[PDB]
Amino acid sequence: MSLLYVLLIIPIIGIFLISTIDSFYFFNVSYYKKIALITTILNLIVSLIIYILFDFSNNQFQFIQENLDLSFYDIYLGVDGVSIYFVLLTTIIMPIALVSNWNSITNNIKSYLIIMLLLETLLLAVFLVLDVLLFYIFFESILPPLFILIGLFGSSNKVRASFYIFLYTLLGSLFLLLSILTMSSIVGTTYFDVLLKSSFEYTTQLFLFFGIFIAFAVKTPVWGLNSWLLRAHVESPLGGSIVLAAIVLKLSLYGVFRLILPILPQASLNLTYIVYAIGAITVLYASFSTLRTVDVKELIAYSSVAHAAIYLMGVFSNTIQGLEGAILLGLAHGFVSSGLFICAGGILYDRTGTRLIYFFRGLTQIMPLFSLFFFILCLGNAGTPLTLNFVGEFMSLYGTLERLPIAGMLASTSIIFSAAYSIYMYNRIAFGGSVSLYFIDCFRDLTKREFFILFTLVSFTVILGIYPSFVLDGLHYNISSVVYGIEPNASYLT
Amino acid sequence: VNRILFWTGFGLAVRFWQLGIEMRPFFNRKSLWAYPLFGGVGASFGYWLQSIDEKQTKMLEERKQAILEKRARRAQRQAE
Amino acid sequence: ASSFVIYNISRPGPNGEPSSLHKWFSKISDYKDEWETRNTLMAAALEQAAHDKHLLLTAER
Amino acid sequence: PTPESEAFLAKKPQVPPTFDGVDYEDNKRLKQAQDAIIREQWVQVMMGRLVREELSKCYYREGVNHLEKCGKLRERYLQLLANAKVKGYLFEQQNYWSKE
Amino acid sequence: MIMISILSLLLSTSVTLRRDMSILFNRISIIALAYCILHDTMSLSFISKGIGLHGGLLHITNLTQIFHIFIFIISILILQLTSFYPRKVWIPEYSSLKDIFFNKILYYRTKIINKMGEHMKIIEYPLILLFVISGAVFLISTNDLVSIFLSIELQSYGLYLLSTIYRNSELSTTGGLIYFLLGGLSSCFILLGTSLLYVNSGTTSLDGLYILNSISDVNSWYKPYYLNFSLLIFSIGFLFKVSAAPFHFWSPDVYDAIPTIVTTFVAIIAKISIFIFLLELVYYTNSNANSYLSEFSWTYALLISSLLSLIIGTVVGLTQFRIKRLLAYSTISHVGFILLALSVSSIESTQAFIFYLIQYSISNLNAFFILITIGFSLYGYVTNNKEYKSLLDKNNSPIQLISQLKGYFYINPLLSLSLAITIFSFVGVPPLVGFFAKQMVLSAALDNGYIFLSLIAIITSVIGAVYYLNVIKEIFFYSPEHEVNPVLNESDSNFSLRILNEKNVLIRSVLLKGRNIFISSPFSITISIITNVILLFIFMNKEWLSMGTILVQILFSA
Amino acid sequence: GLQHYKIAMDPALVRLGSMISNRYKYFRWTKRTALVSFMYVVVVPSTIGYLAYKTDGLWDLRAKRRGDLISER
Amino acid sequence: YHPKDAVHLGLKGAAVVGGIGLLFAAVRTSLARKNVGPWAIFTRNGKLAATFAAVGGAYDFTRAAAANLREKEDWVNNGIGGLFAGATMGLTTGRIPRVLGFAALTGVVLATAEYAGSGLRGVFKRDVDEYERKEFLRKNRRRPIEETLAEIGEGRGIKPPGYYERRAQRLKEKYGVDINPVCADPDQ
């Protein structure tokens, strides 16, 4: 069997073991948690084995298994240098997601672990499948377990929040389905190798673009459309919020390198000015309203909207630099947003039971270790050099500017306004007076669990910010096949 | 995937779900014979689906050749 | 200490002459044409069923 | 010239970087065409990298006199900077253009 | 074989008056339907668009036999509901082959198993279903107008009788009355349509009408306007019988009033026969040549019905609080997808039509079994909610409100996920089977120019998903209002079970509490086989979809 | 879930948050709200889009020297 | 093209749409639970029939008018008549927001119905071999460079062979400046 199926089967084996141990024993919930965490370690172990054996400049799909037994819907699993790092991020994030929420679930612990083990399978799949109809199948199988992850383990406004993400993500995904169905009917299949050969007529590509973009604007999400995220990324449990922002948000970032860039190039080129206008607006309106947010977890959720706009504008630049910067900023947001939900929804909400920023002040005086990590995370969210977030923004903004110079200049306002929301939140909670008077008793500082998941996540952000070539070497050759263009003395050689 | 493998497992999955819906214990020793019976029925149904597959393949093959005569022979008569 | 020790150990040398570990690594992950031979077959068959589905779905009523 | 490394044989394109006379339903030939265009564009941009590295040494070697002693390197680097960009193959795969 | 079965069963039930003798007559109705499956299975060794039999008044087709067997198996699964007691008592001491085959268990089974329950006492219930099945498998194979009329009445009249068979319920008799009075008007429409066909064509044979339509379809004294006008009246009656909007107000009321056992059968079987019959009629009334004939195509009524059924079925269901009224409206939104695939007559739409009908009949069946099993499960539970106290026919429909399902995840977690997997299939979420059905119907419509209807369909699918999620949120997002019965576990309350042997000597005595009472195996196994088919279709799709591709290859062949 | 530490929850601030979370239930279409809802959603993005349309491929700085022109069109 | 009398056609919609709504008021009176009488169809439910008449007359007239004004026949006019129909729909409820909301909801449907093609009747048949049409669009993998340039245009990173010499001409015609870049090398 292929080694890419081993990534899928392990979480499946782990769900089986959680449901069949109580039959060998009133077993403790501690042993439920250990099995799920070990089984996400193994996926990470395997995924690094896949990465050692990867070939950084091969234009054929790798780790493929020859099926030669065709059906109507067959799983085809290939790994490519444009998808490898999305897989690695998934497998590094899911253990922290489990450890972060280790004592906070308290009830329905089996069901909680079985959903996350299910989620890791489906999100691993969406990066590994070699069809665009297969891509859609897994891109939307994550929807039922997320409706239940929010309504069982979510906060007060959990019911409306779970309806919002499900219904918005269902609606937006059904316009992508109509366009995928058109592509398949014209071409006969949705297997990548046969689609990338095929070139659609301009008018068809103009109508496939309207349909793949409706979906991804719903799933970025852009400003006019993000009302599900400000509910779902907040009412959800801590572990739900980590997966939703780090991994689920990137399903459409990686889905533009497959669905738009190679098969609808003329449409992408001629409509970019519409994308850039939308992207510029969500860099401003989201930045303006991230200043006035009184919910700490909601402030982090709103930050993701402004970040996602920068990478969306990068993936539409037709430049090798904005394309790699978009993947780097997708990865960068993955580690940093994870840490700030760990700070907001998993530490202050553990100790105070509230998310209102009015009750917090001067937390440096009694939690110095929280303050140190909270400040480093806050500076990466502000796009400060030495973090992977700065590199992703620099390259994303450069390509946005080289393609359409006016929108990149309005996108670069982020540099100013991301810094203004990030420092203002940090100053209000850690600094900004003395330990607040609403704290009747003292609050303990970080536990050894809270320290080491923040430390792990922060370490990824810095070392990748110093040596981004750890991720750039795989991207260069594979990214070099989604650029559309020619130069006069370099093309059509004889 | 292998049909005999999928269907054998499908029968083992059907036993696990039935005990879960009944809330009866999975794996009590004096009832473990159910898993072999459910798996054997899953093996047998699948040997029947392999015979179904074999015949359908012949039929779809013939038809794709017939549509390739109708399109051909019509083009032959349009050459006049 | 560990980084400096490992880094010094894994250096190639004055001119070529890779280590035994290095020779082992490039050996296991060779796949000189194994991905190209497998993907070429699959592309052929999925091209073939792209044609066959048009033929069956576009037949004369 | 510098001896061609052993690692520089498994990745050396065997085909001219074109699509003229390339059957697309032949996947191996088509993929090798694609790979052959990608590597020419990349060698061209790495040729600029190396000339720019020489220009840098010439600049620090000559100091005030850089404005007279490093112009041949300047000329080569400024030619590669407009001749070479990594533009991909997707345009060349989907369009046929001829001298006529 | 269905006719030999009705006559033999009729003679046996005619000379008995014993009500304890009903469970066994339902078991023989399952064995009887198994011989019919062995006969139609062996009648599938030929290729033909059709063979007229019995003087041309009947026809046999590969599509006709497949549907005959599908009808017989869907019938064998509903029959299990009346052939096995709802609950069972299981102990690991009596669980091996030697025990279940050579040993025996004796205890007071009456109040545990509901031996004298209502659904276990009607003796003619296995017979009435067998007369409905007969009308369904005749309608599939009708080659003449009179045969259509006589078959549709055989099926319709037996549905009314099934809906009135709980004679001591004010609800059931009300529903049978609504069904007969609105069903009789539908039959006038079907009779008017056929009469106007014969009176203008001189023929009652469908093939002659097909040829009169074939010769007319060419791009003066006798325009064939009657065919499209006659078939539009004709389809109005069949639209009512399948409850497509606008003629849908009857189904929510009848499906909620009659007992849940009964609504499994009545809400499935009539659509399977009516929709298969319409497909052959749509194929041969097609206008290949764009002429004035295609401007009055009768298929437009199905296009307007489908559009209206998509809207009505998904909008009106938002404010339902009764589960059976909810499920009635959900079926109307599913016939809006079945009706679009039928209206676009293409090779892709017919293959998508065939898949949608079979898989939806299979999944809505799971939705009915899960509901009936949850009703039987609450026997060991009690509740103090004041609203449940005032419900009517609490024995014929145990679950009536969606609020009675609050916190079922806490009572039975996998039964709740079976109801989740089935409802998410109605929504059309991947990788579930119901996704792959709506995918095919949308692709068929888009490929042939029905872009406007596709956008309407995906919009209403969002709206219809709202009331499906309300059911899911109710089962999982809250804590139950149902508590375990305190007496069943009282420590002093135990029922003695005796293990005997072949020569009736005690092997063991055992003390059992309410913790030793479970769901019966026929219900648990049936639920798990269908929940698994919905969840694992992506790994087992070749034989099911290939059967449809071959079937439409023949109907369109030549 | 877990019991948190004691917080002097402010009756005033709790209802302020309860005001914000429920705020949208009371939004109405007035002449004032339409004006803001029209400027932010339509005018400002339409204005940005127009500049993005008219300057597309207008300028390139790549390799351009003295004697050459930044404008590409 | 052939001009059409807008006023005539506009009345036809009023009678056609209004005629149906008159049948709806007949249903309302028949299902009245009191002894309201036959003439109640024109007194109690008259506003039901009037709004159908108002909407029908606005639509067909405004569309036929817009057809005459633009001197074209296409999906666009089914839009203009649609907006003026929903505009009349909201005039009854007396709320300004509903006037815009109904018009947006009404007009977007009618344009979408027409542009997508007439679905509710017989869809237009091209009467051509579908196997040839589908197979051509699957194997139409390369195109003439000139064909693509028309839709996207040379520039924006699409620099086809000869772009510089053409750009020289384009700039000379517009700015009026001869292009002569500096050698940037003191020797040769």
Ligand SMILES: CCCCCCCCCCCCO[C@@H]1O[C@H](CO)[C@@H](O[C@H]2O[C@H](CO)[C@@H](O)[C@H](O)[C@H]2O)[C@H](O)[C@H]1O
């Ligand atoms: C497509 C469908 C939707 C996709 C998402 C699927 C989500 C599946 C969730 C996991 C399955 C159900 O998870 C199930 O939860 C119930 C809650 O009563 C647990 O049941 C147990 O809960 C607690 C645990 O301490 C016990 O005290 C209680 O006695 C027992 O009922 C089961 O041990 C667990 O397996």
Ligand SMILES: CCCCCCCCCCCCO[C@@H]1O[C@H](CO)[C@@H](O[C@H]2O[C@H](CO)[C@@H](O)[C@H](O)[C@H]2O)[C@H](O)[C@H]1O
């Ligand atoms: C969960 C779903 C699992 C799959 C369920 C469906 C599986 C069964 C599908 C069988 C039907 C298609 O498979 C095939 O069809 C054709 C046409 O009808 C039939 O084929 C039959 O007619 C031909 C023609 O004379 C005979 O020579 C042949 O021996 C006979 O089998 C059979 O029925 C079956 O061989």
Ligand SMILES: CCCCCCCCCCCCO[C@@H]1O[C@H](CO)[C@@H](O[C@H]2O[C@H](CO)[C@@H](O)[C@H](O)[C@H]2O)[C@H](O)[C@H]1O
């Ligand atoms: C960081 C992103 C940077 C790129 C985006 C901004 C680029 C701006 C480039 C501006 C210069 C482009 O090229 C420039 O065109 C303008 C057009 O008015 C000319 O500007 C001139 O135009 C007229 C003649 O028409 C003169 O009389 C006038 O004094 C002056 O405005 C310059 O002579 C020419 O050099």
